[PDB]
A paper describes a structure:
We first determined the structure of [name] reconstituted in nanodiscs at 3.4 Å resolution in the absence of either nucleotide or transport substrate. The primary distinction between these structures is the presence of an approximately 20 amino acid loop between TM1 and TM2 of [name] that would be positioned in the intermembrane space and is absent from the structures of ABCB7, ABCB6, ScAtm1, and NaAtm1. While the functional relevance of this loop in [name] is not known, structural characterization of PglK, a lipid-linked oligosaccharide flippase, revealed a comparably positioned external helix between TM1 and TM2 that was implicated in substrate flipping, suggestive that the corresponding loop could also have a functional or structural role in [name]. As previously noted with NaAtm1, the TM6s in these inward-facing structures of [name] adopt a kinked conformation including residues 429–438. The TM6 helical kink in the closed conformation is adjacent to, but distinct from, the helical kink present at residues 429–438 in the inward-facing conformation. In contrast to differences in the structures of the TMDs between the closed and outward-facing conformations, the TMDs in the inward-facing conformation structures of [name] are similar. The primary differences between the two structures of inward-facing conformations of [name] are in the relative positioning of the NBDs which are more widely separated in the apo structure relative to the GSSG-bound structure.
Numbering used by the authors:
A (entry chain B), B (entry chain A): 117 to 716
Write the structure that this text describes.
Amino acid sequence: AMADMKILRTLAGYLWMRDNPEFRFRVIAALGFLVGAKVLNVQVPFLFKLAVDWLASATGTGASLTTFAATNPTLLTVFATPAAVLIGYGIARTGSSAFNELRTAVFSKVALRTIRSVSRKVFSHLHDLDLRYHLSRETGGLNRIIDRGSRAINFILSAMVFNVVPTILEISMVSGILAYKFGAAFAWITSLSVGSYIVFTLAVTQWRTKFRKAMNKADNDASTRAIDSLINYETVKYFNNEGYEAEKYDQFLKKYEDAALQTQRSLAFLNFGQSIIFSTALSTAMVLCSQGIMNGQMTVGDLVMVNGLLFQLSLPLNFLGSVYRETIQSLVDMKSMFQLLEEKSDITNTSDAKPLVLKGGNIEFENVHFSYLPERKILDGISFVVPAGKSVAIVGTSGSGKSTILRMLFRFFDTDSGNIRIDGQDIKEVRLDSLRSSIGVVPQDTVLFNDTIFHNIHYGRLSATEEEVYEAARRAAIHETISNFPDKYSTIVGERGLKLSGGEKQRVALARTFLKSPAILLCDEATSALDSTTEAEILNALKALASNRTSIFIAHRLTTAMQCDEIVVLENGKVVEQGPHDELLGKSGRYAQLWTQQNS
Amino acid sequence: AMADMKILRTLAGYLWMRDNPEFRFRVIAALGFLVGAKVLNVQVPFLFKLAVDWLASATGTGASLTTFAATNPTLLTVFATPAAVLIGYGIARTGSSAFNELRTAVFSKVALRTIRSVSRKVFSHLHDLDLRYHLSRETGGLNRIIDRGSRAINFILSAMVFNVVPTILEISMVSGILAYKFGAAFAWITSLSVGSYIVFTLAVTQWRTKFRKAMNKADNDASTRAIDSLINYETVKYFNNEGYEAEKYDQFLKKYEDAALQTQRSLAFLNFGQSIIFSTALSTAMVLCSQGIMNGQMTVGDLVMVNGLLFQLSLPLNFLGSVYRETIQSLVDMKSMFQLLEEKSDITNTSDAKPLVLKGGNIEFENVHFSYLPERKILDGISFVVPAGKSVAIVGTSGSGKSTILRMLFRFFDTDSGNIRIDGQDIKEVRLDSLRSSIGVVPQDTVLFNDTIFHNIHYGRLSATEEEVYEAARRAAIHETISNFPDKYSTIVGERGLKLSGGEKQRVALARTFLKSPAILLCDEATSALDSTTEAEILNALKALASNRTSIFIAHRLTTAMQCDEIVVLENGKVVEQGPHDELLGKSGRYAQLWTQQNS
């Protein structure tokens, strides 16, 4: 899995921010606080060797004339009386646990920042991605991917920095104390012991996982069975109630109670050998030291430190055994996330950027063909020309697939062989931002976020004052229905708020697009059915809004939009008729039947 | 909360099964394996005091003429050479960890059995409960209650037996070692220390919980916000994409990154004071022992055991601090479960039990009134008499609420002021089992469990042979459609199986009630709409089945069931018309309009 190492490389690439000097200093401090602690925690038993001696010298009849043999602690520190050394022992160990605990605090303000930068970058890249990717993927999946990946990053960094590195620095240093009070043969025994212990725990965890999975399977089966059985209460009650039902549930719970009694004996074998494997080490160490003591070796009274060193090693070893499943799962979730990234968008623009300079809006289509799939090609050469400042209507059946128009004009999908003339300019060259900003559109379904009305009504253009939004309201003719707001026009809307019917939601859409003050207006049959009183007035409002801007309206219903200058009949995904509606009715064409059946 | 102690009393009541001798023996063995371990784990440092001595006697110039002062270990055990004592140390501690681990295995085969008995009893009591309780309560809730309660029982028993009892036996015994090498003042210091440590950890955990809740709130808010934002991609894309959106998500993730950086410093204070509070104890103990050593007290070289005893106490203390939330939550979930139990069913029967001896079925209703709610009383004195072996039809509108009939005849709900004559007998006296067994009914919706066809087809009466189910199939006329089964008539059905249409499901219902061979047949308009070919034949089949048994059919549609002898019109929950259908059509009554609009 070479790509897995590559993913680690990417993680290192993102982790290190050269740009800012402070980050490096933070990391350095962290490392310092990781070393200091782990050397005080070895000073602790050396202080317990020093305090066992001198105590024995007095009353014990130990040779007092040994002066200061080692001469390493010749400093007057902790030599006032033996009680001082014991106090130093306590202070030392407490300070070690302080340094080590402090390191975590120093390194979490770094971990959080890393997670934040990766998540923000992924978010922005996601929105940059083209529509096709979003449509194919499931909405829930994106959530799962981001949350699990961020959690995985946090877990892996904490697991490594706080567990893998301290354990190995500890073991290496302890075995590296071979310079003093040690022999070459003696040092290897502890390393071999700990290596065997780690191998045994890691190997037996794999075995444990199978039993855990079997138990989860059985438990889920029993629960689902007893829920299916409870749900279908009526059938059971009518005839032979709980006659043969309880016995069957009993059998399921016997299978569960056996698959659960098995895992205990399996954990038992591990939790026993995890003791014996580490006890043989301590027995071997002590018996070997005793032989030296009784054989007149330099070792005198220093047996008491070995217990301490072994205890220090014994504490954090257990964590390493159980990290395998988490590591593999996190390391594949991280590949998932970093695979979501680095996916290029289909709709690339050319290098040179030219801004859309549109004096007046003219829509000219020239043999635009587009097939979503090879079998069915939606548009088969639609060509029409809209005069500036006029209204043109696109009508047809629902099979005609007139949804594409909006997607194409917004450059969601590109044309296989055609062009789009905007004020006699080619869209392929102009910047995406300039075009999407200069065009105005009203959505078909007006989804509102959960926030204050004033935010959902100034959303169209930010930096909107209260007077601007007021003038938009007045033209939107919403003041009659807005003075009843419970929170003086700040009432919360959306979920956990006042539910809005379609008419007000449409008014909100109008009072959101009126703010933007666009150059061209495009509609997508916002309302399918509505009360007559609201329809008429909203139609008048949108007619007034569209008076100074060239507009294009796509309406499945005919009577709804008859006010345009020309009407483009669309049937079987091609241009059928181009004229004012009256001779369309008089041509016995598609428009004629559709309208004559709309009124009937 | 006196009732909480009462709940503990109930738990003790259920835990102890006097009936079986083996259970007590198991529990006794468990307790033994809980004592032995916890006394070997105190033998361990005594063996490390014994091995520190004698080693010092040689080469150390220790007085060899002290003979055997204590005379407690005068046994020749572990006196071959000092190496033997070290080996004994290792073997002892390993054996302690074996005994203690073994206890868990011995006590889990008891815990599982307890959980099983409580769950099975609750299940049966649940099914015993009347319909009203089931209808009011939510189906999901019952699941949640059972699963959480069983988990709580397991957690509380394991938590107490494995943690609370060992910790207190350990502490009490250690402080109880006051007989040897101790003073009255010295013993109290350790108890005061550990008591202060437990108080500090418990108190500061409450504080930690508030920060954890704030963090969970903030995390959920950030996630829900970013999902709402991702979902509404279109609105964002049309205008000012990620212009002001990213900054707002950023602010949410700043709030999260602060509420998460706060909890670390809060945990930090706990994880530091949990060290200093326990370090002051060790420093005080050692300095006090050193004063004795230097003052010519009996204590000689036994300082090395105190470290071990303190370490043994230090290991399992941490668990007790975090158990508060789990204990309170489990202790209230247990009250939930034991509150579900001991709820009596409304439909009690009288003491004396008389069996239903029905020579022939005669249905006689006499002024039966029943109101589900005081406002609307469904039945207002329905009285009619069915002759034996005949077919009678109950017809009406959907507002007439004719659903009650089935519930009442099955004695789901009792009559406020009326009686039901079954073969000239009163239902109130006869046993519920006898009546519900002697009556036959076909369900309206035929829910099938996920199992083999042969099980879903012999379900009506257990102990059904292959020939019995074959004859039921032949009369059910299902052999034509059954020889196509992929698994030679053992094909799985239900979910994750072959989906069945309404016609086959109805055939299954017929081939389930035909098995039971009841004395009286009752229908509940099983089919609302179906293909003509199946309807006709299934009607013929049910006519043949009902020929020898008196039958009652409730049909909302009129043309569907015209074959009965008499027809009972029901309108506004009262008997309107009683006759053969032809003069019902000729009476211009409810039946006449209903049928004339069914055919139109």
